[PDB]
Structure 1
Amino acid sequence: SNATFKNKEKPQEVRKANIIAARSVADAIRTSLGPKGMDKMIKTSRGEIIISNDGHTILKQMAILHPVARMLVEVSAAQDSEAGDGTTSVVILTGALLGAAERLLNKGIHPTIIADSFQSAAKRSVDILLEMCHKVSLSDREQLVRAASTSLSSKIVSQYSSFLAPLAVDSVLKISDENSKNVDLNDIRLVKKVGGTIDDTEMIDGVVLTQTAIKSAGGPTRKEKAKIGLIQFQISPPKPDTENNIIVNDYRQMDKILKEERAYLLNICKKIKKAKCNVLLIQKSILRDAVNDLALHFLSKLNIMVVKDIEREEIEFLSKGLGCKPIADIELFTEDRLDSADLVEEIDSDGSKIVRVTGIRNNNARPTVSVVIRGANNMIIDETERSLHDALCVIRCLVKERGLIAGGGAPEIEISRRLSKEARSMEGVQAFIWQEFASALEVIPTTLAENAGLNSIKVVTELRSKHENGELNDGISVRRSGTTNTYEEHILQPVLVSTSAITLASECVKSILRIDDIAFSR
């Protein structure tokens, strides 16, 4: 039957291995599934310390080789790359989904039955979801900061959460334009600085560069009104793309030939000097501080603040903010494609020089922003930057789609109740287990209370005790053991997530219900 040296897996035992494994990832992840979560320290092999609460982080930092578990991650990972949040809350949903699916399955119910029960409830739960959202206008400072301070919290910086919340939304807003429309979170640079505390970070309405300008006799310290030329040619003596030998006929020709190169320097420096464009940003690397070029220093001898080795991705983030067509080459150069910025201060710390284009643009509406993620230790500028990825993208899922969901597990409590209430809709012994998916969905609310300390059963019960007729929105408050609703606490969570997550969970565990053998190999 088996060519030996392999690892098949008995039917009934498979489900155990699958479930018991899958169900356990959540065991480690549930310690972070909540604003009252527990922060971890992840000491790596090299010794590098990373502090995080982010489920995904943990999942990518920790070593996972599990056949079942390794899959659960590849979903929340894809869920983060797409949805942009609710990382952990996906592993959990698969946990209690199998947790509950196994219970009825361990007593007789067919795997393929609950496997239908899944998609069955999936659709109908995607319905309530599309009916649980709220139409939201466009461009509202308070209505957005209400979503930022909801994600950009639950972080190590809880004291300072309302400190990143603004810096989070302000920047995003400065990105969202109506073409039509389209946001580009990739077009808002984030450069981390090492100073002060995690705080002391400054949202910047512009771009902050790492480029430098090292000239004792030159290198202007500031520009009150400096025009900007977006170029990208070598600040150094290149060489023919063919085999190259320059031969000196006479001994004197030596000195005479040493000018055949500097000519290839001024050749462009001339067209650039004529335009008298002031500050320049060559994408080409110098790089940083060390030569080439020596003649580059001569370019700054005409009092012309210029920094090279600029980032490619930050050159587009330059044209929009600067508002100047980044001329790749100077053959068709002009004087129109320059820009302006009220201030350019290249402040330098120790030996590192960060060029800041403060008060830049104002024209073209300053579409690309840049938040300075200051912080002393490294482990700090690690989580802080990891939180914005989940913060900006978060609020940008409202602006992306005009839908929002009440937080504190609204559809979570609601979907189960609808499932628990009227089950007639569908028929067969299948739907009889749609109750599994139902009670399952209550996975987030339960642990949420747990992560706080207040009994998870009592609190979730205090919600099963509020009934009436009208808006009828209810949620659990991790603060006190009570049940303050989310409709008033401004604590909400994007639809783009809830929909693209509630589809992920029940799309894996359903495969798991399906599988009979998980034969392995060497």
Structure 2
Amino acid sequence: KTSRGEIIISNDGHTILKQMAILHPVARMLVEVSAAQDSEAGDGTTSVVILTGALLGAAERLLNKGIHPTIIADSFQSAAKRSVDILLEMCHKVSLSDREQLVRAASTSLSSKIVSQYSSFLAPLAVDSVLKISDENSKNVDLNDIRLVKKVGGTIDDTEMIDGVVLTQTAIKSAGGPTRKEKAKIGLIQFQISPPKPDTENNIIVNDYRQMDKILKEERAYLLNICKKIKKAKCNVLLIQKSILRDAVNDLALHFLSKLNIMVVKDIEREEIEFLSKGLGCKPIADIELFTEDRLGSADLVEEIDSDGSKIVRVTGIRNNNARPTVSVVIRGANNMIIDETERSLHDALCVIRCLVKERGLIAGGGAPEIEISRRLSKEARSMEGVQAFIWQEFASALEVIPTTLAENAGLNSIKVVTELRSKHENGELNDGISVRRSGTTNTYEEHILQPVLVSTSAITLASECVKSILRIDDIAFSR
């Protein structure tokens, strides 16, 4: 229950920790880790927090033995680097050149949502969008370059990739709107073309015919002088930042820019100003005096296409060396709850594919790697000596909290299911895990449960960094 009185509920650890409003400074680090968990891997924000609490619980036993937290934090560094190296040995290497593995990985992420049978066309959408922006050896690929456009109307089966770019706004509905342009150059104008309107008190009083023409000639000439400087730069399409305070583009300016054969799209959302300046490879224009051709783009065709009722503008063929294939995907649906859940479902599908691009390979989820790594670190702990050797044993026991909690939250017997994993993982390798579909221990690879390796890699990496930032705090004082 928020302080404002709003009542919300959900099982997502990212939404819980965001609205939890933790005033405890050390506990606020778990929120930043969940933010980094969603920014890097995109999934596992709940398990990375639980793994942090286990290392803090294991550190409590280390402090009772007279061990200084510096060695405790330093031993977690070698424990995290070793756990990832062991995870890479059991990981099944996959490549981006195989399109059959990416569709199956995206289809399983879409089976957890209300939309299931319609994911047949949704799975290659996220796959084909990444394969164009992946190239090779690109490491991290920002999903912010993929823009999911939500429009009301249509259906789920209607989708257009439009890899070039897609805007959020319609075209001019007044008199003179071209609504289409061929061989266009698209700039980004943060300015707004309006008659002079100072922020102080102003008023227009016309008591005579000479006063009416005086106001009209000063306004029409001031608007035309701005329109003349735009034509000299050969600007076919203009994007005006949306400002509801004053007038964005005057109706007289719409008639002037229509005579000059210049396409006009106004009321551009301020959130997209930062996005359109990157993908289109253009630069922001504060003033008309600095507004020139060098900051424009290149567009073969700019048209307004309306599937049903949307009247959305699309642009193709940026044809720039600095601008690269930034893709904006349009999502359509009947009800408002469709395009919403679909956007969040495809966003999680993009995060799973993003994990495979930065780090190739995948592992079997359901607590499978947590059991085997804990068994190997227990055997490899004999190779160490001194205080650190006991930490390897406690670090292995701290990795078993994730598979134990999965058995507890699913109604299965806690102690029974965990022992079944240690028994089956001895003979087999990563072939068995916890699955809620079979209500027991079975093969997660046959049940189509696939967790990418980058999620388990980032969860262990962020856990070692979170526990470090915790134990390094020996005191707190008021500082203003």
Per the TM superposition, whether the score is higher than 0.5 is: yes
Which stretch has the larger CA shift, 251-260 or 143-152? 251-260
Does the CA-based 8 Å contact 1:177-1:183 persist in structure 2? no
CA distance in 2: counterparts of 1:376 and 1:234, whole angstroms? 35
The share of aligned pairs that are identical, in percent, is: 100
Query: Bigger shift: 435-444 or 92-101?
Result: 92-101
Name the stretch that deviates more: 356-365 or 194-203: 356-365
Conserved in 1, the CA contact under 8 Å of 2:153 and 2:310? no
Question: Which moved further from structure 2: 181-190 or 340-349?
Answer: 340-349
- Contact 2:189-2:284 at 8 Å conserved across structures: yes
Q: Which moved more, 1:310-319 or 1:433-442?
A: 310-319
Q: Is the 8 A contact 2:69 2:472 kept in 1?
A: yes
Change (3 A) 1:216 1:116: closer
Whether contact under 8 Å (1:227, 1:341) holds in the other structure is yes
Q: Is the 8 A contact 1:201 1:374 kept in 2?
A: yes
| Contact in 2 for aligned 1:327/1:333 (Cα 8 Å) | yes
CA contact (8 A) 1:149 1:162 kept: yes
Indicate how the Cα distance of structure 1 residues 350 and 101 shifts in structure 2: closer, same or farther if over 3 A, else same: same
Cα drift, residue 501 of structure 1: 2.6
TM-score of the pair, normalised by structure 1: 0.69
Tell me how far apart the structure 2 counterparts of residues 293 and 410 of structure 1 sit (CA, whole Å).
Answer: 65
1:162-212 per-residue CA deviation (whole Å, 9 max, x = no partner) reads 665443333333333459787443323233334578997765544443323
- Tell me, in whole angstroms, the C-alpha distance in 1 between the residues paired with 2:133 and 2:77: 38
Question: Is the 2:297–2:318 Cα contact (8 Å) retained in structure 1?
Answer: no
Equivalent residue for 2:265? 307
Q: Distance in 1 between matches of 2:397 and 2:338?
A: 38
Structure 1 pair 346–450 and aligned structure 2 pair: CA distance change class (3 A): farther
Per-residue deviation, 1:307: 1.0
Contact 1:227–1:338 (CA under 8 A) maintained in structure 2: yes
Q: Which residue of 1 aligns with 2:403?
A: 445
Whole-angstrom distance in 2 between the partners of 1:223 and 1:91: 52
Equivalent residues of 2:248, 2:266 under 8 A apart:
no
The answer (yes or no) to whether the contact 1:218–1:303 under 8 Å persists in 2 is: no
Question: What secondary structure is seen at the aligned counterpart in 2 of 1:237?
Answer: coil
- Residue 409 of structure 1: CA displacement? 3.3
Provide closer, same or farther for how the CA distance between residues 291 and 224 of structure 1 changes in structure 2, counting only shifts above 3 A. Answer: closer
- Number of the residue aligned with 1:410: 368
Who is 1:200 aligned against?
Answer: 158
Counterparts of 1:317 and 1:112 in 2: how far apart (Å)? 43
- Candidates 132, 146, 149, aligned match of 1:174: 132
* Greater shift in the superposed pair: 89-98 or 191-200: 191-200
Please say which of residues 46-55 and 236-245 is displaced more in the overlay. Answer: 236-245
Instruction: Report deviation, 1:305.
Output: 4.8
C-alpha distance in 2 between matches for 1:330 and 1:139:
47
Distance 1:475-1:115 versus aligned 2 partners, 3 A rule:
same
Secondary structure in structure 2 of the residue aligned to 1:385: helix
Sort the Cα spacing of 1:490 and 1:361 in 2 relative to 1 into closer, same or farther, 3 A. Answer: farther
Task: State the superposition RMSD in angstroms.
Answer: 5.3
Secondary structure of the structure 1 residue equivalent to 2:297: strand
Question: For residues 451-498 of structure 1, what are the alpha-carbon distances to aligned partners after superposition, in whole Å with 9 as ceiling and x for unaligned?
Answer: 433334444433323357786544333321344445566644344443
Greater displacement, 201-210 / 350-359: 350-359
- Residues 1:493 and 2:451 aligned together: yes
Following superposition, the deviation at residue 47 of structure 1 comes to 6.0
Q: CA deviation at 1:117?
A: 5.4
Q: Give the 3 Å change call, closer, same or farther, for CA 351–444 of structure 1 in structure 2.
A: same
Match of 1:136 in 2: 94
Q: Residues of 2 paired with 1:377 and 1:289: CA distance?
A: 33
Q: Distance in 1 between matches of 2:137 and 2:274?
A: 17
Contact 1:416 1:438 in 2 (8 A): yes
Residues 446 and 171 of structure 1, relative CA distance in 2, 3 Å threshold: same
Deviation at 1:58, TM superposition (A): 1.5
Distance change (3 Å), C-alpha of 1:243 and 1:135: same
Contact 1:53–1:155 (Cα < 8 Å) also in 2: no
Would you say the 8 A contact 2:172–2:264 is kept in 1?
no
Equivalences for 1:421-436 in 2 at 5 Å?
A: 421-436=379-394
Deviation at 1:352, TM superposition (A): 8.5
Q: Conserved in 2, the CA contact under 8 Å of 1:283 and 1:312?
A: yes
1:63-85 deviation per Cα after TM superposition (whole angstroms, max 9, x unaligned):
22235433332332344344443
Tell me if the contact between 1:203 and 1:371 (Cα under 8 Å) persists in the aligned partners: yes
Question: How many residue pairs align between the two structures?
Answer: 480
* 3-state SS of paired residue (1:454): coil
My pick for the range that moved more, 102-111 or 291-300, is 102-111
Q: Give the alignment's TM-score, normalised by structure 2.
A: 0.74
Decide whether the 8 Å contact of 1:50 with 1:379 is kept in 2: no
Matching residue of 2:221: 263
Q: Distance in 2 between matches of 1:361 and 1:286?
A: 33
In structure 2, relative to structure 1, the CA distance for the partners of 1:418 and 1:180 (3 Å cut) is closer
Distance 1:293 1:182, change over 3 A: farther
Q: Structure 1's 138 and 219: CA in aligned 2 closer, same or farther, altered over 3 A?
A: same
Deviation digits for residues 205-249 of structure 1, max 9, x if unmatched?
444433233435443566799776666653323589999999999
Q: Secondary structure at the match of 2:197?
A: coil
Segments of structure 2 that go 5 or more residues without pairing to the other structure are none
The 8 Å contact of residues 232 and 282 in structure 1, kept in 2 or not, is answered as yes
Q: 1:459 to 1:383 in 2, by over 3 A?
A: same
CA distance in 1, matches of 2:292, 2:223: 19
Secondary structure, in 3 states, of the residue corresponding to 1:390?
helix
1:96 to 54, 60, 73: 54
Residue 415 of structure 1 and its aligned partner are, at CA, apart by 1.4
**CA drift at 1:436:** 1.9
Q: Against the structure 1 CA distance between its residues 51 and 366, is the aligned structure 2 distance closer, same or farther, given a 3 Å change threshold?
A: farther
CA displacement at 1:93 relative to structure 2: 0.2
CA–CA distance in structure 2, aligned partners of residues 277 and 175 of structure 1: 29
Q: How big is the shift at 1:399?
A: 1.4
* Conserved 8 A contact 1:133-1:495: yes
The superposition leaves residues 356-395 of structure 1 with CA deviations (integer Å, 9 ceiling, x where unpaired) of 5589989999822223355677777666545555442432
Q: Is the 8 A contact 1:233 1:284 kept in 2?
A: no
Alpha-carbon spacing, 1:131–1:434, altered in 2? closer, same or farther (3 Å): same
Deviation of 1:60 after TM superposition, in Å, equals 0.6
> Per-residue CA shift, 1:24-66, capped at 9, x if unaligned?
xxxxxxxxxxxxxxxxxxx655566766543122211222223
Q: Is the 8 A contact 2:164 2:318 kept in 1?
A: yes
Question: 5+ residue gaps in structure 1?
Answer: 1-42
SS at match of 1:338: coil
